[PDB]
Amino acid sequence: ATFEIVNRCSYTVWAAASKGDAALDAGGRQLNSGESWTINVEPGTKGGKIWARTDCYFDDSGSGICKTGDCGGLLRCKRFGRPPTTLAEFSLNQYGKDYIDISNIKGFNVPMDFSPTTRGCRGVRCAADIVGQCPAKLKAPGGGCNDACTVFQTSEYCCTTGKCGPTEYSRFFKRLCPDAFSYVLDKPTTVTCPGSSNYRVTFCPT
């Protein structure tokens, strides 16, 4: 499948694409404002994520640090990033269907639209000013709005027992972005698309 990743933000982001134990495509790249990066994702990829990283510094070897979404100091991410990270999540070609969602379970850093570029399903967006409105206890100094599990590390926020409910903190994310997952057992906002759809992730869509 092809994903076009577009940075519509006024600031540079360092896109990342991983399935947790490997890079997707090159795994990461700098996107200046307006730049588009087209990646190819192998069919059947399960548990892929795309996110943006902010305020990164990398040397010529591709090693460095970002204030949000750092994936072990690498430009080309192999692993998932450090919260807070708005996540585009996808599982492709799963019994003939693709499944996409946006998640705030690991917080929010950059607003995002995640839309098919092929026919037969709708996109999802989380484009509210979550950072601006972020509750004081969840604000990350580096930028971004952390989820409560990251901050507080309780069974309730992290849904460790597989039983958990919404929280004041999950409801904050859900109020601003109803179409994104706000906690682990949120009513799913997954979109089902035809298998082998193509997609565009747009940072700062509005």
Numbering used by the authors: 1 to 206
Task: Provide the publication's sentences verbatim.
Fixed targets (‘chips’) offer efficient, high-throughput microcrystal delivery for serial crystallography at synchrotrons and X-ray free-electron lasers (XFELs). Within this family, sheet-on-sheet (SOS) chips offer noteworthy advantages in cost, adaptability, universality and ease of crystal loading. We describe our latest generation of SOS devices, which are now in active use at both synchrotrons and XFELs. In essence, SOS dispenses with a patterned solid support pane and simply sandwiches a thin layer of crystal slurry (typically 20 µm thick) directly between two transparent polymer films (each typically 2–6 µm thick) to fill the entire window of the chip.
In many instances, a significantly higher yield of indexed lattices per chip is desired. The sample layer is sealed between the two SOS films by clamping them together against an M42x1 O-ring. The large SOS chip has also been used at the ID29 SMX endstation, both to collect data for model systems and with bona fide samples. Excellent high-resolution data can be obtained (the statistics of a thaumatin dataset are given in Tables S4 and S5 of the supporting information). We typically use 2.5–3 µm-thick Etnom sheets for crystals in aqueous solutions and 6 µm-thick Mylar sheets for crystals in LCP. To prevent sample settling yet allow leeway in adjusting the crystal slurry layer thickness, we often add 1.5–2% hy­droxy­ethyl cellulose to the mother liquor. Our layers of crystalline slurries are typically 20–30 µm thick. SOS chips are unique in their cost effectiveness and in their ease and versatility of use with crystals of both soluble and membrane proteins, as grown in both low-viscosity (aqueous solutions) and high-viscosity media (LCP).
